[PDB]
């Protein structure tokens, strides 16, 4: 029942979440793998408070060795969609006054790590 193409590929990496931006802006991802990942389309699950929310992403860039990438959440006034970052247009700048929390999942569902931000005033 072939109404698509196959590819195998190990569309996965060795990323951790930096930091958060204090403001609510932006989520940094930081790729500290032993080689250059393909990142293929891995989904960014954003919790935050009462609901949330989940991004996917798209294979135009290789995660090179200390290489980070941002999301900003919609509201940036960078390019929409680097060559460099990227930019979620699905969701806007959410404000972590609430601790956001971030589920990172691999393209096929399954789990590598989560973090979130530290209860302090601003």
Same mark, same amino acid.
């Given at each position: 029942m072939g109404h698509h193409h196959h590819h195998h590929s190990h569309m996965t990496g060795n990323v951790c979440i930096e930091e958060i931006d204090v403001d609510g802006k932006f989520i940094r991802l930081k790729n500290t793998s032993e080689q250059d990942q393909p990142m293929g389309g891995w989904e960014m699950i954003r919790k935050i408070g009462d609901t949330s929310v989940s991004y996917k992403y798209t294979s135009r860039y290789v995660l090179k060795a200390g290489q980070t990438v941002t999301i900003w959440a #919609?509201?940036?006034?960078?390019? #929409?969609?680097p060559p460099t970052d990227l930019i979620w247009k699905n969701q806007n700048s959410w404000g972590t006054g609430e601790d956001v929390k971030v589920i990172l999942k691999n393209s096929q569902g399954e789990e590598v790590a989560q973090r979130s931000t530290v209860f302090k005033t601003t």
């Open positions: #919609a509201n940036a006034g960078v390019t #929409a969609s």
